[PDB]
Enzyme design. Structure first.
Site, mmCIF file in Angstrom:
data_model
loop_
_atom_site.group_PDB
_atom_site.id
_atom_site.type_symbol
_atom_site.label_atom_id
_atom_site.label_comp_id
_atom_site.label_asym_id
_atom_site.label_seq_id
_atom_site.Cartn_x
_atom_site.Cartn_y
_atom_site.Cartn_z
ATOM 1 N N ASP A 286 7.305 2.240 -5.520
ATOM 2 C CA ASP A 286 6.028 2.729 -5.362
ATOM 3 C C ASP A 286 5.575 1.311 -4.557
ATOM 4 O OD1 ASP A 286 3.348 3.632 -6.093
ATOM 5 O OD2 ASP A 286 3.841 4.175 -8.119
ATOM 6 N N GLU A 492 -6.143 5.804 -12.254
ATOM 7 C CA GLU A 492 -5.475 5.149 -13.200
ATOM 8 C C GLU A 492 -6.260 3.794 -13.546
ATOM 9 O OE1 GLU A 492 -1.488 2.688 -13.207
ATOM 10 O OE2 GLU A 492 -1.364 4.593 -14.147
#
Length: 603
Positions: A286, A492
């Protein structure tokens, strides 16, 4: 004698990979393993560092309003630099095309995954894969960081809308996105092998491995763990389905398992993913995933490179400080801390995807694909998907009431209201233009209001009011109202209201509208949210999720062109204090259970 086996398109993949690998310097190898943001890419960086890959992070666009062909020229310009290296290894460009090619102006925006879960239609999701690959290829990009196959276990998570369902079986079923994006795998196919059919398809990415949807409260970001059969049963199984469909790549999660950061977790990444599932594509970090191995993040980047590469990662989404990544990895290998066999494995896997997908034969964009971007047939697909995602939660205030839905298209005067009735950005939600969403007309699409106006009889007068008061509604002479409200875009860590209550005015607009005329309330949300007050006020209520660019999907069901068929892909809680509360939990006490949905017939 100027013949070079790796450049021979008639040779098997494994031979081309081995031939090319055995020619490469350490610098060329480590280049392959380096992914950088376009924002830091130049032709010199790409050429002098033998860079293997680029990406656009959310909102990383060549300009505001860029056409498909502008995208294509950007990617081709980067690709020309990479092809001019000594070995001429093309770069692979990735992007978050997670509900259509959503960073690109004019791209078709499909429902977010939670909505797709409610369709219970794997084949519809496959076709959305197909259309999405064509729109990504329209822009010259060859790689999409999708599907997210998280199993969201707490709706408080700001990415819950990117999970098809709290029920992993639905998530597993929806891995059919993968052969949509990549093409169907051959008859004789070995689970774990990477596949992409050709230049009209893209590489896909099962993410984020593993346990990204796991608790606690909601999921953003602890360990997001659990234990053991928590894994091998909730969070893992869709990855096996992804292996069977030949997913090309896997992205690792920020989260941890058993207090081990997934980006440093050799047992799961190497022992399980590679050695047990037999994954032979490449594993990608990521964004600054390796930096976050340490607390604080970035505080010892040397250990971050070491730990991640020994864990088994193949390609690092750096994505900005490439010099530091390349220097440090080069020192580690020169110092024998990371063996050449780990590097060769990583590079073998990158090359295997590149060769398998036809990147060496087709490194450049196809100008004839440009018109795939926002192509009407994609929009018709998106319209169908939106319509099939709607869940009808209420259709009449009492068992004796006439059902409000479907509404008649012919009426003297009707009211359309609510902050979400004429707002494209809200209806698309997060990961649109980007990395948040926006408000307003950020792309080509049809809002709920424009859809109503397209649908109704020409004698029907349509009045729009965003937040009318009670008296305006009572005096208007309306036959009915359609009122749309709900969440603002989020992710998020940004704009995630953990109360799960919709922003005001929302409820107050519903009450004012429904207080003076029969109302159909369209709830736009990334998840279940506190809904009783909306239900109590509404004649009918529809959970439309984040339906994307084609608002006509909404009106298709409201006006009875098609019946409602959507079913809840998540549990609807009575109160947030009950969370986490998923199907199978010991005190399962839902307001609406997973699978609930009312229906109508087409009129």
């Amino acid at each position: 004698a100027d013949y070079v086996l790796y450049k021979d398109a008639t040779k098997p993949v494994e031979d081309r990979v081995a031939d090319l690998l055995g020619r490469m310097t350490l610098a060329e190898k480590i280049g392959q393993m380096t992914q950088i943001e376009r924002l830091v890419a130049t032709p010199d960086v790409l050429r002098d560092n033998f860079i293997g890959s680029l990406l656009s992070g959310g909102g990383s666009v060549p300009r505001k309003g860029a056409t498909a062909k502008e995208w294509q020229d950007m990617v081709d310009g980067f690709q020309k630099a990479c092809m001019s290296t000594r070995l001429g290894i093309p770069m692979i460009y990735g992007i978050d095309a997670v509900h259509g090619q959503n960073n690109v102006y004019g791209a078709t925006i499909f429902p977010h995954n939670v909505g797709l879960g409610a369709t219970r239609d794997p084949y519809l999701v496959k076709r959305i894969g197909e259309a999405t690959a064509l729109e990504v290829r329209a822009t010259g990009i060859q790689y999409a960081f999708a599907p997210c196959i998280a199993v969201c276990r707490d709706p408080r998570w700001g990415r819950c809308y990117e999970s098809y369902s709290e029920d992993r079986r639905i998530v597993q079923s929806m891995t059919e996105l993968i052969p949509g994006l990549q093409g169907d795998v051959p008859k004789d196919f070995t689970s774990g092998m990477p596949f992409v059919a050709g230049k009209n398809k893209v590489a896909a990415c099962a993410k984020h491995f593993v346990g990204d949807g796991g608790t606690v409260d909601g999921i953003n970001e602890n360990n997001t763990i659990i234990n053991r059969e928590g894994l091998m049963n909730i969070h893992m199984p869709a990855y096996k389905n992804a292996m069977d469909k030949g997913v090309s790549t896997v992205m690792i999660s920020y989260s941890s398992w058993n207090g081990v950061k997934m980006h440093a977790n050799q047992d799961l990444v190497t022992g399980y993913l590679k050695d047990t599932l037999k994954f032979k594509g490449f594993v990608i970090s990521d964004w600054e995933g390796i930096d976050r191995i340490t607390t604080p993040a970035g505080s010892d980047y040397s250990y971050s490179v070491k730990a991640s590469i020994l864990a088994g990662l193949d390609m690092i989404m750096v994505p900005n400080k490439y010099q530091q990544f390349i220097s440090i990895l080069t020192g580690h290998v020169n110092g024998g801390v990371i063996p050449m066999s780990r590097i060769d494995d990583a590079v073998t896997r990158i090359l295997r995807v590149k060769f398998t997908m036809g990147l060496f034969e087709n490194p450049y964009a196809d100008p004839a694909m440009a018109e795939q971007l926002g192509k009407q047939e994609h929009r018709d697909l998106a319209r169908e998907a939106a319509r099939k995602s709607l869940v009808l939660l209420k259709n009449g205030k009492t068992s004796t009431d006439a059902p409000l839905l479907p509404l008649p298209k012919k009426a003297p005067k009707i009211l359309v209201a609510g902050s979400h009735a004429d707002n494209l950005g809200y209806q698309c939600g997060g990961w649109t233009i980007e990395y948040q969403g926006d408000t307003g007309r950020t792309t080509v699409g049809t809002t709920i209001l424009e859809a109503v106006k397209a649908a109704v009889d020409p004698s029907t007068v349509v009045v729009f009011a965003e937040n009318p008061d009670a008296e305006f509604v009572k005096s208007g002479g309306f036959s009915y109202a359609i009122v749309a409200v709900g969440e603002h875009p989020y992710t998020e860590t940004k704009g995630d209201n953990l109360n799960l209550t919709i922003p005001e005015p929302g409820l107050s607009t519903v009450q004012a509208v429904c207080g003076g005329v029969r109302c159909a309330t369209v709830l736009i949300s990334g998840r279940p949210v506190v809904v009783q007050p909306l239900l109590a006020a509404s004649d009918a209520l529809v959970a439309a999720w984040l339906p994307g660019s084609e608002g006509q999907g909404v009106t298709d069901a409201l006006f009875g062109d098609f019946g409602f068929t959507g079913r809840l892909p998540r549990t609807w809680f009575k109160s947030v204090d009950q969370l986490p509360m998923n199907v199978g939990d010991a005190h399962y006490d839902p307001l609406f259970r997973l699978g609930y949905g009312l229906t109508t017939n087409a009129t």
